[PDB]
XYZ file of C-alpha atoms in Angstrom:
674
model
C 30.716 -53.125 -0.667
C 29.759 -55.514 -3.555
C 26.937 -57.722 -2.237
C 25.428 -54.944 -0.098
C 25.073 -52.858 -3.260
C 23.257 -55.700 -5.033
C 20.653 -56.433 -2.351
C 20.295 -52.690 -1.835
C 19.507 -52.320 -5.587
C 16.966 -55.162 -5.305
C 15.458 -53.310 -2.339
C 14.734 -50.285 -4.588
C 13.969 -52.308 -7.707
C 10.543 -50.668 -8.217
C 11.856 -47.108 -8.049
C 14.240 -48.007 -10.915
C 11.927 -50.091 -13.078
C 9.299 -47.383 -12.873
C 11.601 -44.822 -14.540
C 14.779 -46.032 -16.227
C 14.394 -47.077 -19.845
C 17.406 -49.346 -20.216
C 17.771 -48.724 -23.936
C 19.098 -45.179 -23.288
C 21.781 -46.619 -20.955
C 22.958 -49.810 -22.774
C 25.300 -47.650 -24.801
C 27.740 -47.292 -21.908
C 27.154 -50.711 -20.441
C 28.889 -52.271 -23.405
C 31.698 -53.497 -21.182
C 29.381 -55.399 -18.762
C 26.305 -56.476 -20.619
C 27.121 -58.804 -23.528
C 25.845 -58.201 -27.064
C 22.988 -60.723 -26.953
C 21.539 -59.338 -23.720
C 21.736 -55.745 -24.836
C 19.662 -56.654 -27.885
C 17.343 -58.834 -25.831
C 16.658 -55.869 -23.542
C 15.875 -53.637 -26.559
C 13.368 -56.146 -27.929
C 11.645 -56.379 -24.525
C 11.421 -52.571 -24.374
C 9.170 -52.670 -27.461
C 6.734 -54.713 -25.346
C 7.070 -52.709 -22.111
C 9.629 -50.166 -20.864
C 8.764 -51.161 -17.286
C 9.572 -54.707 -18.440
C 12.810 -53.783 -20.166
C 13.821 -52.004 -16.963
C 12.979 -54.991 -14.835
C 14.979 -57.266 -17.161
C 18.009 -54.963 -17.293
C 17.898 -54.817 -13.506
C 17.340 -58.594 -13.431
C 20.461 -59.059 -15.541
C 22.671 -56.535 -13.793
C 21.822 -58.043 -10.392
C 23.279 -61.398 -11.410
C 26.331 -59.697 -12.958
C 29.753 -59.897 -11.248
C 32.563 -58.189 -13.246
C 34.892 -55.497 -11.828
C 32.814 -52.374 -11.261
C 29.658 -52.724 -13.319
C 27.860 -50.862 -10.575
C 29.863 -47.669 -10.920
C 29.549 -48.137 -14.664
C 25.756 -48.325 -14.380
C 25.700 -44.988 -12.548
C 28.171 -43.467 -15.002
C 25.900 -44.583 -17.867
C 22.720 -43.336 -16.139
C 24.465 -40.006 -15.615
C 25.345 -39.910 -19.312
C 21.846 -40.833 -20.410
C 20.487 -38.016 -18.245
C 19.001 -40.063 -15.400
C 20.639 -37.782 -12.843
C 17.727 -38.542 -10.581
C 18.213 -42.276 -10.285
C 22.004 -41.728 -10.254
C 21.728 -39.729 -7.003
C 18.982 -41.916 -5.551
C 20.889 -45.230 -5.797
C 24.237 -43.516 -5.018
C 23.171 -42.148 -1.672
C 20.571 -44.914 -1.239
C 17.934 -42.286 -0.649
C 14.774 -42.533 -2.715
C 12.733 -39.919 -0.836
C 12.767 -37.533 -3.834
C 11.573 -40.121 -6.355
C 8.876 -41.240 -3.878
C 7.413 -37.721 -3.689
C 6.844 -37.840 -7.447
C 4.588 -40.918 -7.352
C 1.706 -38.620 -6.320
C 2.198 -36.214 -9.225
C 2.496 -39.152 -11.550
C -0.677 -40.643 -10.071
C -2.290 -37.252 -10.861
C -1.265 -36.610 -14.482
C -2.555 -40.067 -15.463
C -5.924 -39.197 -13.898
C -6.129 -35.725 -15.578
C -4.862 -37.084 -18.908
C -8.130 -36.515 -20.873
C -7.709 -32.867 -20.048
C -4.407 -32.807 -21.879
C -5.610 -34.326 -25.180
C -5.415 -31.166 -27.231
C -2.345 -29.610 -25.527
C 0.306 -29.025 -28.247
C 3.212 -31.093 -27.072
C 5.686 -29.434 -29.457
C 4.832 -26.149 -27.631
C 5.119 -27.739 -24.185
C 8.508 -29.535 -24.735
C 10.878 -26.560 -24.425
C 9.516 -25.809 -20.965
C 9.235 -29.503 -19.984
C 12.597 -30.350 -21.571
C 14.765 -30.792 -18.464
C 12.174 -33.228 -17.123
C 12.470 -35.564 -20.151
C 15.475 -37.486 -21.569
C 17.459 -36.527 -24.679
C 15.863 -38.993 -26.927
C 12.350 -38.838 -25.444
C 12.079 -35.238 -26.494
C 12.923 -36.213 -30.045
C 10.479 -39.177 -29.953
C 7.606 -36.918 -28.966
C 8.699 -34.448 -31.593
C 8.562 -37.294 -34.145
C 5.240 -38.802 -33.058
C 3.814 -35.328 -32.940
C 4.859 -34.478 -36.529
C 4.869 -37.816 -38.377
C 1.851 -39.402 -36.739
C -0.464 -37.054 -34.863
C -0.480 -34.318 -32.211
C -2.637 -36.057 -29.597
C -0.484 -39.130 -30.116
C 2.403 -36.858 -29.149
C 0.939 -35.366 -26.002
C 0.031 -38.890 -24.960
C 3.675 -39.999 -25.290
C 4.873 -36.855 -23.536
C 2.737 -37.540 -20.422
C 3.967 -41.144 -20.809
C 7.515 -39.845 -20.358
C 6.761 -37.330 -17.628
C 5.438 -40.104 -15.407
C 8.709 -41.959 -15.770
C 10.668 -38.754 -15.057
C 13.153 -39.131 -12.245
C 13.201 -35.389 -11.504
C 11.653 -33.891 -8.372
C 11.815 -30.716 -10.427
C 9.081 -31.635 -12.985
C 5.630 -31.190 -11.674
C 6.682 -27.574 -10.946
C 8.033 -27.264 -14.499
C 4.856 -28.668 -16.095
C 2.778 -26.060 -14.296
C 5.076 -23.321 -15.554
C 5.046 -25.121 -18.910
C 1.229 -25.192 -19.093
C 1.005 -21.586 -17.909
C 3.520 -20.226 -20.401
C 1.820 -21.844 -23.402
C -1.527 -20.665 -22.034
C -3.440 -23.895 -21.302
C -5.062 -22.082 -18.419
C -7.737 -24.760 -17.620
C -5.343 -27.735 -17.362
C -2.776 -25.487 -15.622
C -5.319 -24.409 -13.023
C -6.364 -28.041 -12.587
C -2.758 -29.068 -12.176
C -1.503 -27.610 -8.830
C -0.220 14.433 -4.704
C -3.849 13.489 -5.391
C -6.725 14.626 -7.601
C -9.416 16.992 -6.352
C -12.224 14.438 -6.260
C -9.943 12.067 -4.340
C -9.173 14.732 -1.741
C -12.896 15.551 -1.545
C -13.720 11.869 -0.973
C -11.141 11.774 1.854
C -12.236 14.958 3.676
C -14.779 13.601 6.202
C -12.505 10.680 7.166
C -9.630 13.143 7.761
C -11.968 15.036 10.103
C -12.249 11.812 12.117
C -15.815 10.975 11.168
C -16.896 7.403 10.438
C -17.066 7.433 6.652
C -18.574 5.343 3.854
C -16.798 6.361 0.634
C -19.143 5.405 -2.219
C -17.108 6.193 -5.336
C -17.029 4.117 -8.496
C -14.663 1.272 -9.318
C -11.626 2.832 -10.979
C -11.763 6.221 -9.255
C -9.150 4.743 -6.942
C -10.792 4.387 -3.563
C -7.860 2.299 -2.213
C -5.641 5.325 -2.787
C -8.131 7.621 -1.000
C -7.784 5.182 1.917
C -3.976 5.477 1.956
C -4.496 9.268 1.886
C -6.831 8.972 4.906
C -4.304 6.621 6.523
C -1.371 9.030 6.445
C -3.536 11.968 7.605
C -4.573 9.661 10.435
C -1.038 8.906 11.599
C -0.024 12.546 11.094
C -2.657 13.835 13.524
C -2.682 11.074 16.196
C -2.505 12.776 19.579
C -0.980 12.096 22.982
C 0.755 8.781 23.731
C -1.852 6.592 22.008
C -0.152 4.817 19.079
C -2.256 4.384 15.950
C -2.991 1.035 14.344
C -4.791 0.226 11.090
C -6.603 -2.762 9.663
C -7.520 -3.016 6.029
C -10.183 -5.683 5.705
C -10.547 -7.234 2.216
C -13.081 -9.956 1.321
C -11.791 -12.091 -1.587
C -8.198 -13.391 -1.191
C -6.861 -12.002 -4.504
C -7.984 -8.464 -3.531
C -6.465 -9.041 -0.118
C -2.979 -9.728 -1.518
C -2.936 -6.891 -4.063
C -3.782 -4.578 -1.152
C -1.274 -6.121 1.262
C 1.487 -5.599 -1.305
C 0.229 -2.094 -2.099
C 0.174 -1.034 1.584
C 3.441 -2.849 2.213
C 5.000 -0.961 -0.691
C 3.651 2.488 0.082
C 4.085 2.662 3.849
C 7.128 0.489 4.688
C 9.440 3.129 3.208
C 7.878 5.888 5.349
C 8.946 3.913 8.450
C 5.888 1.830 9.309
C 5.538 -1.915 9.813
C 3.051 -3.431 7.372
C 2.372 -7.167 7.792
C -0.477 -9.146 6.185
C -2.276 -11.986 7.983
C -4.399 -14.482 5.962
C -5.886 -17.989 5.586
C -2.425 -19.332 4.751
C 0.175 -15.730 16.496
C -2.314 -12.918 15.798
C -1.454 -11.358 19.184
C 2.078 -10.485 18.044
C 1.390 -9.789 14.363
C -1.163 -7.108 15.307
C 1.084 -5.739 18.078
C 4.314 -5.629 15.988
C 2.570 -3.896 13.060
C 1.199 -0.418 12.381
C -0.833 -1.517 9.337
C -2.412 -4.982 9.007
C -3.997 -6.112 5.730
C -6.340 -9.000 6.610
C -9.233 -11.294 5.592
C -12.117 -10.579 7.954
C -12.858 -14.199 8.959
C -9.436 -14.412 10.657
C -10.282 -11.694 13.158
C -13.784 -13.187 13.633
C -12.169 -16.560 14.346
C -9.332 -15.264 16.568
C -11.877 -13.175 18.493
C -14.159 -16.110 19.372
C -11.248 -18.569 19.438
C -9.983 -16.340 22.281
C -6.776 -14.807 20.896
C -8.348 -11.342 21.109
C -11.223 -9.815 23.156
C -10.933 -6.046 22.702
C -11.329 -4.247 19.367
C -9.642 -1.141 20.841
C -6.238 -2.386 19.646
C -6.901 -0.461 16.434
C -7.461 3.226 15.791
C -8.808 2.686 12.230
C -10.629 -0.179 10.487
C -10.925 0.180 6.713
C -13.543 -2.097 5.152
C -13.064 -2.817 1.451
C -16.256 -3.592 -0.457
C -18.092 -2.600 2.733
C -21.624 -3.118 1.394
C -21.205 -6.752 2.404
C -21.758 -5.776 6.058
C -25.088 -7.615 6.639
C -26.425 -10.698 8.424
C -23.845 -13.470 8.771
C -21.035 -11.953 6.669
C -17.957 -11.492 8.855
C -17.753 -7.681 8.723
C -21.135 -7.678 10.421
C -19.906 -10.198 13.010
C -16.946 -7.894 13.627
C -19.208 -4.846 13.746
C -21.784 -6.254 16.196
C -18.868 -6.657 18.598
C -17.774 -3.093 17.789
C -21.286 -1.919 18.499
C -21.312 -3.625 21.932
C -18.034 -1.983 22.916
C -19.741 1.306 22.049
C -22.893 0.462 23.995
C -21.484 -1.581 26.896
C -18.177 0.085 27.719
C -17.902 3.425 25.974
C -14.094 3.020 26.108
C -12.178 3.909 22.893
C -13.458 2.688 19.524
C -11.561 2.652 16.248
C -12.535 4.978 13.424
C -14.516 3.165 10.754
C -14.006 3.771 7.029
C -16.116 1.852 4.492
C -15.179 1.583 0.811
C -17.568 0.625 -2.006
C -18.602 1.095 -5.620
C -22.281 0.910 -4.648
C -24.330 0.994 -1.429
C -27.022 -1.186 -2.938
C -30.747 -0.635 -3.123
C -31.940 -3.743 -1.241
C -35.403 -4.893 -2.253
C -36.340 -1.248 -2.579
C -39.055 0.022 -4.887
C -39.004 3.737 -3.939
C -36.379 6.396 -3.291
C -37.704 6.457 0.286
C -37.333 2.662 0.578
C -33.814 3.048 -0.820
C -32.904 5.759 1.721
C -34.160 3.445 4.471
C -31.938 0.654 3.168
C -28.820 2.781 2.784
C -29.438 4.164 6.240
C -29.674 0.639 7.598
C -26.297 -0.280 6.123
C -24.806 2.841 7.649
C -26.179 1.838 11.056
C -24.340 -1.507 10.831
C -20.981 0.225 10.151
C -21.635 3.137 12.522
C -21.336 5.650 9.720
C -21.568 9.388 10.342
C -21.158 10.541 6.731
C -21.588 9.058 3.224
C -18.746 10.530 1.167
C -19.169 10.899 -2.618
C -17.697 13.095 -5.368
C -19.933 16.173 -5.718
C -17.876 19.377 -5.917
C -15.802 17.552 -8.584
C -18.097 15.413 -10.785
C -16.724 17.206 -13.820
C -13.255 15.773 -13.061
C -14.223 12.215 -12.110
C -16.304 11.930 -15.290
C -13.262 12.906 -17.323
C -11.001 10.373 -15.673
C -13.366 7.531 -16.550
C -15.893 7.781 -19.345
C -18.737 5.474 -18.345
C -19.690 4.822 -21.939
C -23.191 5.030 -23.442
C -24.567 1.519 -24.086
C -26.512 0.811 -27.330
C -28.575 -2.113 -26.068
C -29.703 -4.098 -29.123
C -32.064 -7.037 -29.102
C -31.373 -9.256 -32.049
C -33.559 -12.082 -33.314
C -32.436 -15.692 -32.873
C -32.829 -19.059 -34.602
C -36.525 -19.934 -34.980
C -35.433 -23.592 -34.869
C -32.089 -25.051 -33.797
C -32.016 -28.849 -34.282
C -28.257 -28.994 -33.879
C -28.828 -27.776 -30.337
C -31.427 -30.507 -29.799
C -29.123 -33.259 -30.994
C -26.191 -32.220 -28.824
C -28.219 -31.254 -25.727
C -29.520 -34.788 -25.749
C -26.007 -36.266 -26.123
C -24.908 -34.302 -23.027
C -27.925 -35.708 -21.195
C -26.962 -39.251 -22.143
C -23.336 -38.605 -21.160
C -24.193 -37.013 -17.778
C -26.387 -40.063 -17.331
C -23.503 -42.449 -17.991
C -21.207 -40.320 -15.770
C -23.514 -40.877 -12.776
C -23.337 -44.646 -13.346
C -19.547 -44.199 -13.009
C -28.964 -26.075 -18.231
C -26.679 -26.654 -21.264
C -24.659 -24.242 -23.400
C -23.957 -21.811 -20.598
C -20.924 -20.263 -18.974
C -22.712 -21.604 -15.850
C -22.229 -25.153 -17.128
C -18.563 -24.661 -17.975
C -18.001 -23.434 -14.416
C -19.881 -26.447 -13.102
C -17.384 -28.601 -14.905
C -14.490 -26.638 -13.398
C -15.888 -27.321 -9.926
C -16.714 -30.954 -10.594
C -13.163 -31.402 -11.969
C -11.472 -30.171 -8.789
C -13.704 -32.652 -6.929
C -12.070 -35.537 -8.840
C -8.601 -34.043 -8.425
C -9.372 -34.332 -4.678
C -11.123 -37.705 -4.186
C -8.044 -39.856 -3.317
C -10.434 -42.343 -1.620
C -9.422 -45.787 -0.270
C -8.987 -48.606 -2.856
C -6.574 -46.766 -5.167
C -6.861 -49.072 -8.216
C -10.652 -48.686 -8.373
C -10.167 -45.063 -7.313
C -7.871 -44.282 -10.243
C -10.176 -46.056 -12.703
C -13.201 -44.093 -11.469
C -11.442 -40.693 -11.539
C -9.890 -41.298 -14.942
C -13.437 -42.102 -16.096
C -15.033 -38.972 -14.586
C -12.594 -36.596 -16.307
C -13.141 -38.229 -19.694
C -16.896 -37.666 -19.378
C -16.535 -34.080 -18.230
C -14.047 -33.231 -20.956
C -16.606 -34.570 -23.421
C -19.439 -32.726 -21.734
C -17.322 -29.595 -21.981
C -16.769 -30.101 -25.738
C -20.495 -30.534 -26.286
C -21.301 -27.534 -24.078
C -18.982 -25.363 -26.105
C -20.380 -26.675 -29.376
C -23.843 -25.405 -28.422
C -22.372 -21.987 -27.682
C -20.668 -22.009 -31.111
C -23.960 -23.078 -32.612
C -25.966 -20.270 -31.000
C -23.680 -17.270 -31.424
C -21.951 -18.416 -34.640
C -22.515 -20.685 -37.652
C -23.789 -24.221 -37.444
C -20.835 -25.534 -39.459
C -18.485 -24.050 -36.898
C -20.380 -25.969 -34.236
C -19.913 -29.321 -35.969
C -16.399 -28.639 -37.241
C -15.386 -28.007 -33.633
C -16.765 -31.332 -32.487
C -15.310 -33.136 -35.506
C -11.772 -32.024 -34.646
C -12.402 -33.160 -31.113
C -13.317 -36.768 -31.799
C -10.649 -36.896 -34.538
C -8.204 -36.344 -31.653
C -9.989 -38.534 -29.083
C -9.346 -41.296 -31.645
C -5.675 -40.409 -31.926
C -5.087 -40.280 -28.153
C -5.440 -43.207 -25.667
C -8.904 -44.104 -26.962
C -10.132 -45.814 -23.814
C -13.036 -48.241 -24.032
C -15.152 -45.378 -22.644
C -13.741 -42.888 -25.134
C -14.617 -45.257 -27.965
C -18.107 -45.557 -26.588
C -18.532 -41.808 -26.342
C -17.059 -41.276 -29.842
C -19.355 -43.994 -31.149
C -22.340 -42.470 -29.453
C -21.555 -39.241 -31.340
C -20.918 -41.021 -34.622
C -24.433 -42.432 -34.334
C -25.651 -38.835 -34.507
C -23.087 -37.423 -36.927
C -24.774 -37.867 -40.287
C -27.806 -35.882 -39.120
C -25.486 -33.157 -37.875
C -23.590 -33.198 -41.206
C -26.873 -32.806 -43.111
C -27.687 -29.747 -41.016
C -24.203 -28.359 -41.661
C -25.130 -28.495 -45.321
C -28.486 -26.629 -45.721
C -27.279 -23.726 -47.899
C -30.284 -21.885 -46.357
C -28.541 -21.949 -42.889
C -28.131 -18.525 -41.278
C -27.687 -17.374 -37.704
C -29.842 -14.242 -37.648
C -27.916 -13.242 -34.542
C -24.621 -13.280 -36.469
C -26.273 -11.618 -39.443
C -27.100 -8.648 -37.214
C -23.592 -8.423 -35.820
C -22.289 -8.387 -39.416
C -24.775 -5.654 -40.124
C -23.817 -3.534 -37.083
C -20.179 -4.016 -37.996
C -20.736 -3.117 -41.682
C -22.816 -0.073 -40.689
C -20.119 0.928 -38.166
C -17.475 1.014 -40.903
C -19.357 3.514 -43.096
C -20.361 6.470 -40.881
C -16.646 6.232 -39.982
C -14.483 3.732 -41.942
C -11.445 4.477 -39.730
C -12.957 2.607 -36.768
C -11.024 0.156 -34.562
C -13.666 -2.243 -33.205
C -13.157 -4.629 -30.288
C -15.540 -7.582 -30.418
C -16.147 -9.545 -27.227
C -17.427 -13.080 -27.805
C -18.614 -15.542 -25.170
C -15.858 -18.263 -25.251
C -12.480 -18.969 -26.889
C -14.235 -21.547 -29.058
C -16.258 -18.621 -30.326
C -13.522 -16.120 -30.995
C -11.888 -18.552 -33.435
C -15.273 -19.413 -34.908
C -16.350 -15.796 -35.412
C -12.980 -15.002 -37.051
C -13.820 -17.572 -39.727
C -17.253 -15.983 -40.209
C -15.896 -12.466 -40.533
C -13.196 -13.779 -42.869
C -15.778 -15.492 -45.135
C -18.303 -12.645 -45.502
C -18.982 -10.582 -48.679
C -20.282 -7.654 -46.551
C -17.164 -7.560 -44.346
C -14.987 -8.313 -47.367
C -12.998 -5.168 -46.717
C -12.072 -6.533 -43.238
C -9.617 -9.158 -41.978
C -10.049 -9.709 -38.222
C -7.348 -10.284 -35.591
C -7.585 -12.063 -32.209
C -6.127 -12.445 -28.735
C -3.189 -3.945 -39.887
C -6.215 -4.825 -37.741
C -9.358 -2.727 -37.221
C -11.394 -5.654 -35.829
C -9.851 -7.623 -32.947
C -12.076 -10.349 -31.488
C -11.421 -11.138 -27.812
C -13.241 -13.219 -25.222
C -14.310 -12.056 -21.782
C -10.993 -10.235 -20.961
C -5.447 -2.500 -26.664
C -6.643 0.802 -28.145
C -10.279 1.018 -29.131
C -12.982 3.124 -30.568
C -16.169 0.991 -30.752
C -16.621 -1.861 -28.242
C -19.214 -4.555 -29.003
C -20.187 -7.257 -26.508
C -21.692 -10.053 -28.573
C -23.981 -11.677 -26.028
C -23.022 -10.976 -22.502
C -25.095 -12.223 -19.567
C -23.897 -10.369 -16.440
C -23.418 -6.604 -16.209
C -21.616 -4.634 -18.940
C -20.429 -1.435 -17.202
C -17.787 -3.422 -15.244
C -16.693 -5.682 -18.132
C -15.995 -2.604 -20.341
C -13.636 -1.158 -17.727
C -11.642 -4.442 -17.642
C -12.578 7.626 -26.668
C -16.237 6.492 -26.387
C -18.729 3.850 -27.713
C -20.352 0.532 -26.836
C -22.971 -1.843 -28.233
C -24.456 -4.832 -26.365
C -25.864 -7.295 -28.888
C -28.311 -9.554 -27.026
C -30.911 -12.008 -28.217
C -32.665 -12.313 -24.827
C -35.455 -10.053 -23.529
C -33.941 -10.816 -20.130
C -30.706 -8.820 -20.669
C -32.369 -5.872 -22.429
C -35.063 -5.397 -19.745
C -32.463 -6.273 -17.095
C -29.712 -3.719 -17.651
C -32.645 -1.286 -18.017
C -33.400 -2.290 -14.420
C -29.816 -1.783 -13.231
C -29.846 1.771 -14.605
C -33.032 2.640 -12.714
C -31.584 1.206 -9.502
C -28.277 3.050 -9.991
C -30.134 6.336 -10.364
C -32.489 5.582 -7.449
C -29.502 4.878 -5.203
C -27.782 8.116 -6.141
C -30.868 10.261 -5.538
C -31.293 8.537 -2.188
C -27.632 9.174 -1.258
C -27.844 12.758 -2.509
C -30.892 13.096 -0.253
C -29.324 11.609 2.925
C -26.224 13.764 2.374
C -28.343 16.895 2.446
C -29.691 16.041 5.931
C -27.889 17.674 8.839
C -25.422 15.716 11.015
C -27.812 15.713 13.974
C -30.708 14.188 12.048
C -28.594 11.525 10.360
C -26.922 10.631 13.621
C -30.260 10.088 15.292
C -31.560 7.923 12.436
C -28.471 5.710 12.581
C -28.568 5.569 16.380
C -32.281 4.751 16.445
C -31.665 2.024 13.854
C -29.033 0.464 16.119
C -31.353 0.565 19.147
C -33.979 -1.302 17.133
C -31.475 -4.100 16.573
C -30.423 -4.471 20.233
C -34.108 -4.988 21.047
C -34.259 -7.793 18.387
């Protein structure tokens, strides 16, 4: 067909003129396009590639020489447009159509990508782009500017005729570690045996052992003692309930991997028929809300299916949380039927202390929790503390209050710019990891929108991102300001706008940049003050210096608040006469500076709001440098509570079965009556 092919090609005009750049294909159209045209197409490309495409298509459609069509394909194939080649050759554009949503996305997220290093991206993105586009980006990136590059890269990705790309750009972003944009894109030890003992005896257990001691393993130990001793013709079944979905999957794969080989069936149900899955499996790793749904929903009305329910992070069993929903049903089947209930095993790092003030009030709280899970024993390492304490060395914490800036005008000036920006954002609590997270949430709310009038939709979303990316940059700059030097604050922002200018530079972006430029010369004048000194930083430098003298063979790990900081602090440690004998590293070196998560010997958290104990564990020594009375008098609280809990648990444990049973049973009867 000759004339079918032409009209067909007109019928998919848009799919072609929103990707092909004719210039890359005129080489091998030399037989069918005359000289003048070829040039004329090139000149139009300089004005608009979409245009050039349209024209080339315009000119080919009124062509008529032997076999231009095949020649067009054979040139497209050469050029690399293997997408288009297939899509016009089988007259199926479904694949290219699917892309128009990922294109529509990148353009909306663009502001996010400003500072992404396109040279670093290219090798992973390379199949998505054409020969010569890769070298154009490379050129713009080097010769002109780096933002200017990334802008031309995302320019090319949108014209990519490769269903394969969005997937590649995710992998691309992930490899080079742009983890914000990427995310936006889309046999046993003694103490272990001791922990297991009361569950192996068939008692309802609440293992309260610390994170790291390997509770999950103690559960698998309980699990295979459970199968091994199951009597009669009753077949055993197990559920491992896990709250958060990441924990769920680790566990699924762990239980899969351990037990499958021994002969069992280990499937894992989750948010992504329950009847069969539970019935065709011996072990079932699961999110609790599924059961709770499929119970009410009607799929299941009998909890006797199982012989053992293992609750991970079991302290959550209160009020509306699903475990409790599950358990209230369990507790009826005890009370109403007295048929055959599964064994309960709870797992947790801590059994809380509620709103307790006393050890008595703590006991009463722990006992309440136990009532909800129908616990008969609270299992903890006792005849083996020696060993546990070896395996993990819960390190002594030098809490150190440091003084802070008596006056911080830099903070004032930015804070107020954020306030003006937020203001303007609407029309379309600063300097905190809380804020940053707010931005991460707000940004997935724009990635969603997708609401109605798409032209006004894609102007409004574009706009939102730009604001939030600027709010982010300000937010960070405060955090540089507070924990590090004031110059490092401003420097950071300077580089930012310097790029903003080199990128797209939307009307809005210009406004925002301007609005900052209005305030810059103040900020510059503050950067100057040769008096300037962050008394926080000065104390860190002191602790560091003092650390390297009582033992000058000391490998220190320094945790800063943000990435912005790590780089900033490195400068400060580099430029200090006191730490002149020290060159710091990041992620030879006896001072590596990391951010919130290597061999060590003195760990130092430089500001950290939110508990330390758990951050350290994701050889002995640790210093928390805080400038807030809050933290100092707060971790002092957590210690008291931790000790109160333990005394209370030690106390309960020393009751006799009888007494504890009755307390738990009485507690349950109180609840039925209310």
